[PDB]
Amino acid sequence: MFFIKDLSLNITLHPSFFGPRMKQYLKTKLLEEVEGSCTGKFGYILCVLDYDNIDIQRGRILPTDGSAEFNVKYRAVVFKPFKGEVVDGTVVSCSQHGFEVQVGPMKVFVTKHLMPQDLTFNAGSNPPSYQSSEDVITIKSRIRVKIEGCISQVSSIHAIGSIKEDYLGAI
Amino acid sequence: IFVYQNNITPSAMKLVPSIPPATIETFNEAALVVNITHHELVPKHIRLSSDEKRELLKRYRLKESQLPRIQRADPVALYLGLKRGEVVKIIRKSETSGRYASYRICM
Amino acid sequence: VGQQYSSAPLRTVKEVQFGLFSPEEVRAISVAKIRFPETMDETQTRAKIGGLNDPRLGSIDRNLKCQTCQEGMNECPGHFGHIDLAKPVFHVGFIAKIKKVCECVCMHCGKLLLDEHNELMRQALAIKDSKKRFAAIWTLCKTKMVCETDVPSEDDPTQLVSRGGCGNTQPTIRKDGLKLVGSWKDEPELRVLSTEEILNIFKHISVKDFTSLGFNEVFSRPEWMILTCLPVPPPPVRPSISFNESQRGEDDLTFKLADILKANISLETLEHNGAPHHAIEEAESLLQFHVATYMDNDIAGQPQALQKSGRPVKSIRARLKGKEGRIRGNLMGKRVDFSARTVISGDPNLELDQVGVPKSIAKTLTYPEVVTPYNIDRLTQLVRNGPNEHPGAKYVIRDSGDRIDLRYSKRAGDIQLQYGWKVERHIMDNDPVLFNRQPSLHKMSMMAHRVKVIPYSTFRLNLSVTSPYNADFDGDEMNLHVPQSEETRAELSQLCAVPLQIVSPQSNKPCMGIVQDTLCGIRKLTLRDTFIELDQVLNMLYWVPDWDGVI
Amino acid sequence: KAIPKDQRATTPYMTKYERARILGTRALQISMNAPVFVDLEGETDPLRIAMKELAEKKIPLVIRRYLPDGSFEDWSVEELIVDL
Amino acid sequence: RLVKALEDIMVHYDNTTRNSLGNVIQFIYGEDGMDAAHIEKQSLDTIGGSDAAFEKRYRVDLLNTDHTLDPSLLESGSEILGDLKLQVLLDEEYKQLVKDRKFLREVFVDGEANWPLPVNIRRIIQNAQQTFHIDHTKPSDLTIKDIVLGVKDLQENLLVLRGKNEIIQNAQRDAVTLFCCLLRSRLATRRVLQEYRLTKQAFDWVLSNIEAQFLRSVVHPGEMVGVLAAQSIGEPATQMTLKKVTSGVPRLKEILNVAKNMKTPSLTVY
Amino acid sequence: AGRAALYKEVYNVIASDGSYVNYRHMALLVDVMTTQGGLTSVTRHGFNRSNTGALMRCSFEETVEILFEAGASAELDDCRGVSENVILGQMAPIGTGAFDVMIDEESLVKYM
Amino acid sequence: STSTFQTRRRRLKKVEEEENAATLQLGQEFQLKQINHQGEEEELIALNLSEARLVIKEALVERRRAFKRSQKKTREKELESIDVLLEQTTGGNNKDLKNTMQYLTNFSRFRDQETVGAVIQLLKSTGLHPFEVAQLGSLACDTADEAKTLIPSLNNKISDDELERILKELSNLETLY
Amino acid sequence: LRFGEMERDCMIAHGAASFLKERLMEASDAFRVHICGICGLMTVIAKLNHNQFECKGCDNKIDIYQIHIPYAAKLLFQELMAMNITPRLYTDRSRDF
DNA sequence: AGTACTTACGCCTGGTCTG
DNA sequence: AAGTACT
RNA sequence: AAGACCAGGC
């Protein structure tokens, strides 16, 4: 599920930094406008690998100002969930309408009615929870969810998942 | 090569392109009385081997279409009998540099 | 340009894909229903009705709103609108083809009229050139007026092979006004080809048929030469003109649309009301008309669609037609800033490559210098000096993209400069500039000179650099343009400077010489007869500035 | 497509258009507070510093020479001879 | 029109003249690759002059008391007279200046000898002259090899096109040909020693200059020659302010229009 | 041979006025007017029909008429033409722009 | 944006964008046949947790190093040991990475680049597709059902018995705590 | 003042690339528009603030460019579109050559 | 053989009338 | 007005 | 402010 996709980016550098250690600045700016970014087509850019052998190539100088433009070809560890993916995480928030599990950098939410039946929701609990014949789900409890649908948004990705199938529930 | 006098019958001419590979050409007497290639102006041309050609392109990194062309009916083109695709090398004199090499593909 | 920053990457246009608009896209793209023909006055109340211009298109009244797109007037380009027609219309300029296409394919089953089967056709299908296939094809089947069903294959003319069916005779066609007519042949049968029909026959034409004919499955299908949904250029294409308030000022365009709209509704309200069958096709011509004139007005079918007062009407086409218009008079050539013009006069005391710029102008024209440790000082001085003394400046601009107008601003004499800031300053002695004299027909009709600020009011150029510009001082005027980028100048001084133009390639020989006085005089001074005595010889020596001081 | 530093075929010399543009381009940068790779003998006019960087052939730029078919050849201000 | 018709045309890096498509128009700008700017009217001495004079000027025979270089010119003069291995270089040189002749007389039938060409050799020497205060009295110090074997090595470095193959390195010899004739013409043994008493110094200099002064006259891949050419014509077509035939502006109009019905059709038959 | 004539004739139109023009120019022109195939006229009926992208032929005598039939047969424009770029506000591939310029970071080190 | 190794020649009509599901149909950007920078082809890159934990660690570390080559001129124990590696070589505003390291390091199933090595040397004999050869590595599984159900893309590509031996050897190698 | 055809034709002659662009843009028109990397039009609804970008129809939000072009040109295009003709602006060459 | 079709230097400064 | 090209 | 003419300058 987590991936290592081969990407590339374009950074426009002002002449100012056309210093001796330019390579250094580039890389650094690569990492500012990448690590922690989010797209629906790539998912979560979490970490740039092989910091060293980052290919810079020759950048060309634009043509009105001196800013130069290099196509930084790198490689990193991405992660973008899918509909029908099975992943388990740590619960965080839990309300009348359901609880939200946190799978990695993302947050998957489970609808009360997307859970089973015999499981009710106890509001008068502290911390808040969901009770069952034998199961007890609350804050720190670990669950295993099945992602039913995804929704991209700004700089993140949420999604709804169910625990109404088999081999699904707490662990 | 066939040589007609005053002319041929339009019923006849439409029988040349009916037996390929073999090729035929038609020339009127009056146009062969003088060799056009001997004229002060018309410089000498030369046919290029399908080898010599595939080279002319590769050396100038040219596509076939970017090449200067000569008419399939062009007088000299007939004097040598070119075929749509055959290239010719035109070598003439120059007041800027004695000799200038040029090429003409066909269409 | 424009100001405000955008996280949008930025590139250069590399290819230009010419297509035709699919009513479908036209819709998609739009943001304007455009149902009403009126302008504004929501019952006189000022604003705009969700009818024409602004049912969300661009705007006016200096008011952000451009579909929240805010930004306002400058930096909103327009946002196309659409307006569903009542019945398909021709495309004034395409008519020419819409015809030729039909004469190329027959109705009912809509398909070519010559397949691989016919040999003259083969030679016509290898040609790789839209202009050439479609031109050879046409010529080849414009004559055949029968949808063959069966034709004699590559074998015996005895044996007859079968292909597509429906031998429904093909009618020849002629152009009458904005409509297509054809006969069907004892004695003919003349009927009007309804747009609604043509469209169809095209819609059905085959994919490999499109292409076989000069077309393109994705960008331009014939079925599109016929309008069904009309794009509606937003204000900026047809802006207004306000005389403050309670008056008008509408643009010509904003009217033919107003028209087209009227003529569209009147129609419709007929196909849903008392529809006297063929008393409608009298108002469907009107639309076909307007939706045609809107784009073109100089047709052979006379009627100029003269607008009240007999003023012609500016058809879109007309705005682009050669000279004085867009393409040729707006894009290929423009009015420009940082430019001056006055009268020229000789001045035998300037180096060849100089040019006398009158102080008046040197103080008007400006150059954007960027504050740098190398200059800071000099620059702050110019800034301190102000925009009235000469060696000075008249505008400081900081990173925050804000203009400090040196002539006002309570901080005039204050200001501390900042590396990075720019300082529009006055043109100064030795700023390279492009000088020129129209008509321009030489590399040399435009050369770069060294600026030499001088009094009085006339560009003072050296004599010898006269013949290149081809100018006299009998009251001739010249133009001066001032560079702007540190690299821009570079191009002038390194390739346009006069000293470089001395030997003209247009005739592999020098192109500037010595004339009048200098010439005439240079001869006299030469003669064996001519002798000069000490007292003078000495001064003369002094004049040649590079004299080695060796009498 | 690119082309090996060998098999190179262009003109060993700098074209006026090139040099013209290099100096400009270089000025522009220098004028923008880019670093200057030569000792300023006291100069203070960018295009003049640029003229200097260009004579001690200390300009870090590369002139990519596109050919009619798209391929290019890359030369450095270093290499390129400057007659003019 | 002229302008709109040639905008797109310029000299491309390969030294070809193409437009916006890629269509070659000239395979070498101006059939020679020289920037018009660096060119002057020179004279191809080799052409004009009786077959007689030619010999007395360019002919050298080391095997003859009256057709050899009088040792008053060449340092190693007396020790040359007779040498047979030299007479071959010397004879090659002549059977060439000879070929040059016919060649030229096959191109410029008129007999006209003054033509525009790069590198002004006349002057390049003139300087060499007073730059080394060459005295017309004492003798030179050039081996006959020194000469004939450097003139050759010169032509070798007069590169216009640089290709690494045959088809190209062949157009080369071509675009130069006309020049060299002039070249071999002015740097002929006899001449080099009897007319302009060059020393080895002078010579080796005259040579350096020519090569570089030539490599300068080449054309810069960048020039927007199309526009240029246009203007160069239309321009003087404005200064036209006006034995009985259509002539001038109305004519030029005719021509460009490729008009079929010209007012004057004439035709000269010899 | 024709070229040789076209030129010869044109040359005579400039010499009859006692003015001199260096071959190359009338040569080039004569050539442009002849490569293609036969005699292509310097007019709206000729060189303005060639395979040159639209936008370029746009700027001459048929403008709209030419543009129309461009979206019709979905032409594609290279933007290699002088005019093209001028219309876009881009630096055209002409002299100063017959190439690109780059910062070789490597050589940007031995320089200090 | 951040471009992605292949220029999918978009001809105006962008419409077909399939469904994302455990039918192994992943966005165009994740077919199994993608392109490497060198210009070669290369199988997709499927990281199962605790393998990712190692790869992220690996670089974050070799980063700290080359981040000083230029300055001259047990469960809970790893929570601290990493937060540091970050507050050193991270954006410090990469709250995502922080949260990815916790998760990645809490739910992980292997500590030895040697143990994880076998995990790989094992499953990579299946011919199975990378997304499976990942869900398998980071998901507990006792029966072929708990498996072939939480990874439907398997259903017919492998007998229950085999997929069960592999599961046996998983919990065997499953490093302790 | 005027910098028309003829005066251009000279700058092209001179081979003064940049200066030409400068007269033509930075000293006259110059304008910053947005495009769709899909359908090469000005459609795009740029809210330069909340960065929102969209372009419903070709429907985007991701693939979007910014280009600088002579306003007159923008207008050339808009006018063309209004005549139902499409001028596509693409930032990458796919046709090669 | 008749008819139609697109064109026509470059720039610049005045004053005048009207739907 | 002419010249060319197309019908 | 836009658009038609007329006079005129080189």
Ligand SMILES: Nc1nc2c(ncn2[C@@H]2O[C@H](COP(=O)(O)CP(=O)(O)OP(=O)(O)O)[C@@H](O)[C@H]2O)c(=O)[nH]1
């Ligand atoms: N673009 C234009 N250039 C012109 C015009 N009149 C003159 N010139 C240029 O100025 C030029 C020279 O000759 P003139 O016509 O000025 C006549 P004049 O007798 O005054 O010449 P001079 O004997 O040089 O005084 C003329 O050749 C054109 O090159 C004109 O109306 N338009």
Ligand SMILES: [Mg+2]
């Ligand atoms: Mg005058």
Ligand SMILES: [Zn+2]
């Ligand atoms: Zn808006």
Ligand SMILES: [Zn+2]
């Ligand atoms: Zn039919």
Ligand SMILES: [Zn+2]
């Ligand atoms: Zn779009």
